[PDB]
């Protein structure tokens, strides 16, 4: 339960709003920019950790990456934007 | 903003009275029971939304949770009762 408590301490603290937050339209957790999140927030809650380790723990607790929507004529996706949903 | 319009269509519609309403005393919005609100009202205005997401939007528009008054010898607070005040109307 150590991970979960840190997860909520992180997501439900408005001071982290710019790096990770509940989605406006939906019930998912959004990390607008992966690199910024790893730089600014991860070190504050998870010492000596990286994004892959973080995602592996999120997956262990039911949260998975949402399939990104391919945008425009280039069918582009911002690889740095990550959204997670819970199996519920 | 689209959110604000939905907020008022929700709060000022007498049909939602039991789940969310202007307070009798003060100038705040009261959600007597969080769980019931999420089950009965939220879906009608915000499809696929949860309480945290709703509160995040409220905060964006100046509404913040009121400091809970601790009751009796147990210093208790009903975690399911939420009252919101607007920074512009203290």
């Amino acid at each position: 339960p150590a991970f979960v408590n840190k997860l909520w301490s992180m997501v439900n603290d408005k001071s982290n709003e710019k790096f990770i937050h509940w989605s406006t339209s939906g019930e998912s957790i959004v990390v607008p920019n992966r690199e910024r999140f790893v730089q600014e927030v991860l070190p504050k809650y998870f010492k000596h950790s990286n994004f892959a380790s973080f995602v592996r723990q999120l997956n262990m607790y039911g949260w998975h990456k949402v399939q990104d929507v391919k945008s425009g004529s280039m069918l582009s996706n911002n690889d740095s934007r990550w959204e997670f949903e819970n199996e519920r």
Side-chain angles (χ1 to χ4, degrees), chain A residues 5-37:
Chain A
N5 289 166
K6 279 180 175 179
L7 175 65
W8 297 135
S9 175
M10 183 169 68
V11 180
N12 292 327
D13 185 325
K14 70 169 178 177
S15 70
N16 298 310
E17 162 71 17
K18 187 192 178 183
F19 308 107
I20 181 168
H21 63 257
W22 284 104
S23 64
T24 303
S25 59
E27 304 158 291
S28 62
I29 289 174
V30 183
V31 172
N33 188 306
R34 169 182 55 207
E35 291 68 33
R36 293 296 295 147
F37 170 72

Side-chain angles (χ1 to χ4, degrees), chain A residues 21-82:
Chain A
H21 63 257
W22 284 104
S23 64
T24 303
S25 59
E27 304 158 291
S28 62
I29 289 174
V30 183
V31 172
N33 188 306
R34 169 182 55 207
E35 291 68 33
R36 293 296 295 147
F37 170 72
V38 173
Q39 286 164 38
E40 301 299 310
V41 183
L42 204 55
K44 297 185 181 182
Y45 298 95
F46 297 102
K47 315 298 180 177
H48 199 186
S49 190
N50 58 212
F51 197 65
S53 178
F54 176 70
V55 172
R56 172 173 169 272
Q57 281 170 285
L58 280 177
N59 292 180
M60 298 198 312
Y61 292 86
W63 295 85
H64 304 284
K65 188 181 194 296
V66 175
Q67 79 166 186
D68 326 77
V69 178
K70 299 301 199 57
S71 302
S73 60
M74 286 293 198
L75 303 180
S76 59
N77 180 57
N78 173 8
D79 190 61
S80 292
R81 183 186 178 86
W82 286 61

